[PDB]
């Protein structure tokens, strides 16, 4: 019945230190629809975050795209924190520039 | 040259917290063009006032029918009014390059599980369990499939052709993928090759790794196609390879927007 | 263009 979400953290364009970009967190494959998502920067929540509106796939599972404008640097750490009913504790997926 | 129009509908009860969430999202191929939401493309904006008044009216009435379904469903499964439940449906039509109907669709899911679906003959139903059989019987008596069939073969096909023409500049045009292969050593002997495809549209795409001309189908880590955030899509496939024998590996990219499938391979400056 | 559904499940 319930399906745990898949989480992907990545940038819109290949990450280059100093070039403005978009940090995305694609959360999909989940059921039911209730969910909470946060983009994090160095372990701290990012306030200027937008997201798509609740929609679902052909397999019936829901998905959302959370994003924010950002400028990658050599030191800044980025992640995505998701909280869904199928999760005993919020899950955090780190952003890997190579993923 | 073929296209499709599909609506994705949701009705989710929120007992003790408010009224049910109702949603309807329309797509032409992989482009969202309309969205109705109880909690709330340029070529659709040009539709007159009647188009919007009528569609809004249909959505509102549809949510009332969904309220009826949700409560009938609770009865079938003998569920209480205390838990939240979700009713979903996907419907639409597929047309060939000639704008002619290829096949219609109309299926429903209850709490994330296939419930009942209109068969390809758009004349019969396939129920998932005894509950859906109650629904099936009720709908055969009401000739619901005939009504749904009329929409799918008529209204559906007609408006898809219209949208395809009104937004042709963006619809019947596909965005080729920007590709690049990355390398990241897991150790001395084994390394990693990742084939990237970015900024493509539609989402349909094929990425395969082959060595000595043979698909490494089993040693390929392929991720789910994802949205870039700008209407385009992304996807990659990774494979592990021994240091030195990387030129023995090629990535084969197949996509509508490409004049010819690409046969890429990794690289440094 | 939306389809109107009159019959509930």
Q: Let me know if residue B9 belongs to a domain.
A: yes
Nearest CA in chain B to A62: B112
Is residue B161 in a domain? yes
Method: X-ray
- Answer yes or no: is B217 within a domain: yes
Domain boundary among B121, B139, B173: B173
Instruction: Compare CB distances from A32 to B86, B227, B228 and report the shortest one's residue.
Output: B86
Angle (CA) B87 B164 B206, round 5°: 75
Whether the bond into B202 is cis, omega within 30 of 0: yes
Residue ending a domain, among B150, B173, B196, is B173
SS (H, E, C) chain B: CCEEEEEEEEEECCCCCCCCEEEEEEEECCEEEEEEECCCCHHHHCCCHHHHHHHHHHHHHHHHHHHHHHHHHHHHCCCCCCCCCEEEEEEEEEECCCCCEEEEEEEEEECCEEEEEECCCCCCEEECCHHHHHHHHHHHHCCHHHHHHHHHHHHHHHHHHHHHHHCHHHHCCCECCEEEEEECCCCCCEEEEEEEEEEEECCCCEEEEEECCEECCCCEEECCCEECCCCCEEEEEEEEEECCCCCCEEEEEECCCCCCCEEECCCCC
Boundary-marking domain end, from B123, B144, B173 = B173
State the residue range of the domain holding B185. Answer: 174-264
Instruction: Give the residue from B101, B130, B135 showing the smallest Cα distance to B118.
Output: B135
Query: Do B54 and B112 belong to one domain?
Result: yes
Domain count, chain B: 2
Residue B269 lies in a domain: no
Q: For B135, name the nearest residue in chain C, comparing CA atoms only.
A: C9
**Which domains are delineated in chain A?**
1-99 (2.60.40.10)
User: Do B115 and B188 reside in the same domain of the chain?
Assistant: no
We report the CATH number of the domain holding residue B242 as 2.60.40.10
Contact state of B227 with A10 under an 8 Å Cβ cutoff: no
Whether residue B137 sits in one domain with residue B198:
no
Examine the domain organization and report whether B222 and B244 are in the same domain. yes
Q: Resolution in angstroms for this experimental structure? A: 1.9
Same domain for B206 and B85: no
A8, two tokens? 């992907």
Same domain, B249 and B131: no
Q: Do B113 and A61 touch (CB under 8 A)?
A: no
Q: Nearest CA to CA, how far is A41 from chain B (Å)?
A: 19
User: Any idea what the CATH number is for the domain that residue B124 is in?
Assistant: 3.30.500.10
B155/C3 CB distance under 8 A: yes
């Amino acid at each position: 019945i319930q399906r745990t979400p898949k989480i992907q953290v990545y940038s819109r364009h290949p990450a280059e230190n100093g070039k403005s970009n978009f940090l995305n967190c694609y959360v999909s494959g989940f059921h039911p629809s209730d969910i909470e998502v946060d983009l994090l920067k160095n372990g701290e929540r990012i306030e200027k975050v937008e997201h798509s509106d609740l929609s679902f796939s052909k397999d019936w599972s829901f998905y959302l795209l959370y994003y924010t404008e950002f400028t990658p640097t050599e030191k800044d750490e980025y992640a995505c924190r998701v909280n869904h009913v199928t999760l005993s504790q919020p899950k955090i997926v780190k952003w890997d520039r190579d993923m | 040259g073929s296209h499709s129009m599909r609506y994705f509908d949701t009705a989710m009860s929120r007992p003790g917290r408010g009224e049910p969430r109702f949603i309807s999202v329309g797509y032409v191929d992989d482009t969202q063009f309309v969205r109705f939401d109880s909690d709330a493309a340029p070529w659709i904006e040009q539709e007159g006032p009647e188009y919007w008044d009528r569609n809004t009216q249909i959505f509102k009435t549809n949510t009332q029918t969904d309220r009826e379904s949700l409560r009938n469903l609770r009865g079938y499964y003998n569920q209480s009014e205390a838990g939240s439940h979700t009713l979903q449906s996907m419907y639409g039509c597929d047309v060939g390059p000639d704008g002619r109907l290829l096949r219609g669709h109309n299926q429903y899911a209850y709490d994330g599980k296939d419930y009942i679906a209109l068969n390809e003959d758009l004349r019969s139903w396939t129920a998932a369990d005894t509950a859906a059989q109650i629904t099936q019987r009720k709908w055969e008596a009401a000739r619901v499939a005939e009504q749904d069939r009329a929409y799918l073969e008529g209204t559906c096909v007609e408006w898809l052709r219209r949208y395809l023409e009104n937004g042709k500049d963006t619809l019947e045009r596909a965005d080729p993928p920007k590709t690049h292969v990355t390398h990241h050593p897991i150790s001395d002997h084994e390394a990693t090759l990742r084939c990237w495809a970015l900024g493509f549209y539609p989402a349909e795409i094929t990425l395969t790794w082959q060595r000595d001309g043979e698909d490494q189908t089993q040693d390929t880590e392929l991720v789910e196609t994802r949205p870039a955030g700008d209407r385009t899509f992304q996807k990659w496939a990774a494979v592990v390879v021994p240091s030195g024998e990387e030129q023995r590996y090629t990535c084969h990219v197949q996509h509508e927007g490409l004049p010819k499938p690409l046969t890429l391979r990794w690289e440094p400056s | 263009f939306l389809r109107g559904r009159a019959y509930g499940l």
